[PDB]
Design an enzyme around this catalytic site. Structure first.
Site, mmCIF file in Angstrom:
data_model
loop_
_atom_site.group_PDB
_atom_site.id
_atom_site.type_symbol
_atom_site.label_atom_id
_atom_site.label_comp_id
_atom_site.label_asym_id
_atom_site.label_seq_id
_atom_site.Cartn_x
_atom_site.Cartn_y
_atom_site.Cartn_z
ATOM 1 N N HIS A 1 4.646 103.008 21.302
ATOM 2 C CA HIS A 1 3.333 102.508 21.697
ATOM 3 C C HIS A 1 2.922 102.954 23.101
ATOM 4 O O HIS A 1 1.815 102.668 23.556
ATOM 5 C CB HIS A 1 3.238 100.971 21.548
ATOM 6 N N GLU B 1 12.638 106.682 41.299
ATOM 7 C CA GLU B 1 11.679 105.795 41.944
ATOM 8 C C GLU B 1 12.189 104.391 42.235
ATOM 9 O O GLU B 1 13.059 103.878 41.537
ATOM 10 C CB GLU B 1 10.446 105.645 41.048
ATOM 11 N N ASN C 1 9.933 102.193 44.991
ATOM 12 C CA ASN C 1 8.555 101.791 45.270
ATOM 13 C C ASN C 1 7.677 102.866 44.628
ATOM 14 O O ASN C 1 7.633 103.997 45.104
ATOM 15 C CB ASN C 1 8.307 101.725 46.782
ATOM 16 N N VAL D 1 4.804 104.485 47.002
ATOM 17 C CA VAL D 1 5.162 105.212 48.216
ATOM 18 C C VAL D 1 6.219 106.267 47.939
ATOM 19 O O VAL D 1 7.182 106.003 47.224
ATOM 20 C CB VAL D 1 5.747 104.256 49.286
ATOM 21 N N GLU E 1 12.580 110.967 44.794
ATOM 22 C CA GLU E 1 11.723 111.065 43.620
ATOM 23 C C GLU E 1 11.670 112.484 43.076
ATOM 24 O O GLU E 1 11.786 113.455 43.818
ATOM 25 C CB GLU E 1 10.282 110.637 43.934
ATOM 26 N N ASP F 1 9.522 101.532 16.843
ATOM 27 C CA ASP F 1 8.835 101.739 18.110
ATOM 28 C C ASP F 1 9.731 102.497 19.080
ATOM 29 O O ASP F 1 10.318 101.922 19.999
ATOM 30 C CB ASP F 1 8.428 100.384 18.695
ATOM 31 N N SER G 1 10.700 90.108 29.781
ATOM 32 C CA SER G 1 10.095 91.370 30.184
ATOM 33 C C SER G 1 8.613 91.103 29.916
ATOM 34 O O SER G 1 8.270 90.074 29.323
ATOM 35 C CB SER G 1 10.622 92.543 29.340
ATOM 36 N N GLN H 1 4.178 92.923 30.035
ATOM 37 C CA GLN H 1 3.305 94.095 29.990
ATOM 38 C C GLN H 1 3.668 95.008 31.152
ATOM 39 O O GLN H 1 3.835 94.543 32.278
ATOM 40 C CB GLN H 1 1.843 93.680 30.129
ATOM 41 N N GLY H 2 3.787 96.302 30.880
ATOM 42 C CA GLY H 2 4.136 97.235 31.937
ATOM 43 C C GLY H 2 5.609 97.596 31.902
ATOM 44 O O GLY H 2 6.019 98.611 32.462
ATOM 45 N N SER I 1 7.084 97.885 28.997
ATOM 46 C CA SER I 1 7.151 98.611 27.725
ATOM 47 C C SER I 1 7.853 99.957 27.836
ATOM 48 O O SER I 1 7.587 100.725 28.761
ATOM 49 C CB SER I 1 5.739 98.872 27.184
ATOM 50 N N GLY I 2 8.715 100.245 26.865
ATOM 51 C CA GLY I 2 9.431 101.510 26.845
ATOM 52 C C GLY I 2 10.671 101.556 27.713
ATOM 53 O O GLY I 2 11.461 102.501 27.618
HETATM 54 C C1 109 Z 1 2.425 96.340 22.788
HETATM 55 C C2 109 Z 1 2.289 95.980 24.264
HETATM 56 N N1 109 Z 1 3.024 94.750 24.545
HETATM 57 C C3 109 Z 1 4.224 94.840 25.039
HETATM 58 C C4 109 Z 1 5.064 93.701 25.362
HETATM 59 C C5 109 Z 1 6.333 93.930 25.882
HETATM 60 C C6 109 Z 1 7.171 92.883 26.205
HETATM 61 C C7 109 Z 1 6.768 91.574 26.011
HETATM 62 C C8 109 Z 1 7.692 90.481 26.233
HETATM 63 N N2 109 Z 1 7.233 89.250 26.403
HETATM 64 N N3 109 Z 1 8.997 90.710 26.265
HETATM 65 C C9 109 Z 1 5.506 91.331 25.494
HETATM 66 C C10 109 Z 1 4.649 92.380 25.164
HETATM 67 O O1 109 Z 1 3.452 92.012 24.667
HETATM 68 C C11 109 Z 1 0.818 95.800 24.627
HETATM 69 O O2 109 Z 1 0.167 94.937 23.925
HETATM 70 O O3 109 Z 1 0.339 96.470 25.552
HETATM 71 CA CA CA Z 2 8.295 106.153 45.288
HETATM 72 CU CU CU Z 3 1.780 93.151 24.242
#
Ligand code: 109
Ligand code: CA
Ligand code: CU
Length: 223
Positions: free
Chosen positions: A40, A52, A54, A57, A62, A84, A172, A174-175, A177-178
């Protein structure tokens, strides 16, 4: 990462940041030319940033390398998030050192109760938005399949597992992810989805990497 702690500069050498003018996803370096992330997180114009801490900066260490190709799993389903996983090939091999290193793929799946390390530059707040400059860390256990399925009835496939805390407060987000879920020196999961962030009874859901080892190896060998 919600409820985590500051990892410390370059203490997670395999962690990568996928960048397109801003950080949008995490990833893991598995060898000098390949990164594993979530399907995704796919998009064109991806620049992989290694070494990385920071992300706002240039501190040294890096390495910015453009992605030459991104390979989303052929059976990835965007509605269910089954399969995924995505492989990214770097335009040029990364220079491996103490600050930039690869993480090993598992030889067997991890069991419930196994403690793992999850990391990323994702949102740190459960109710609101607050992105950190430096890498955040979180130690979380893999939950039993029964608890995972009771939390997300009919949404958990054999290619997913839950990890985290049922009491909420640590997860974990948003952000992230992956990003990596490393247990005993092996990459066992990829940050995939969940319901909100750090909510009670709603643990994070992760892509079960041990089910894709053969696919990853066979795909890398032919590209
Ligand atoms: C698919 C993506 N969401 C990713 C995502 C990743 C981790 C968590 C979590 N609570 N562990 C929740 C999420 O909703 C998005 O909707 O951007
Ligand atoms: Ca940096
Ligand atoms: Cu999500």
């Amino acid at each position: 990462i919600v409820g985590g702690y500051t990892c410390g500069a370059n203490t997670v050498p395999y962690q990568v940041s996928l960048n397109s003018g801003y950080h949008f996803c995490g990833g893991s370096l598995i060898n000098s030319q390949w990164v594993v992330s979530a399907a995704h997180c796919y998009k064109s114009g991806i620049q992989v940033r290694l070494g990385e801490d920071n992300i706002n900066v240039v501190e040294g260490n890096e390495q910015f390398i453009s992605a030459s190709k991104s390979i989303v799993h052929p059976s990835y389903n965007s509605n269910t998030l089954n399969n995924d996983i995505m492989l990214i090939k770097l335009k040029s091999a990364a220079s491996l050192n103490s600050r930039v290193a690869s993480i090993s793929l598992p030889t067997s799946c991890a069991s419930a109760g196994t403690q793992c390390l999850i990391s990323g530059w994702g949102n740190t707040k459960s109710s609101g938005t607050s992105y950190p400059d430096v890498l955040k860390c979180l130690k979380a256990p893999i939950l039993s399949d029964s608890s995972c399925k009771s939390a997300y009835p009919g949404q958990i496939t054999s290619n997913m597992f839950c990890a985290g805390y049922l009491e909420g407060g640590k997860d974990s987000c948003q952000g992230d992810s992956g990003g990596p879920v490393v247990c005993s020196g092996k990459l066992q999961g990829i940050v995939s989805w969940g319901s909100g962030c750090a909510q009670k009874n709603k643990p994070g859901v992760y892509t079960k990497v041990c089910n894709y080892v053969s696919w990853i190896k066979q795909t890398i060998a032919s590209n």
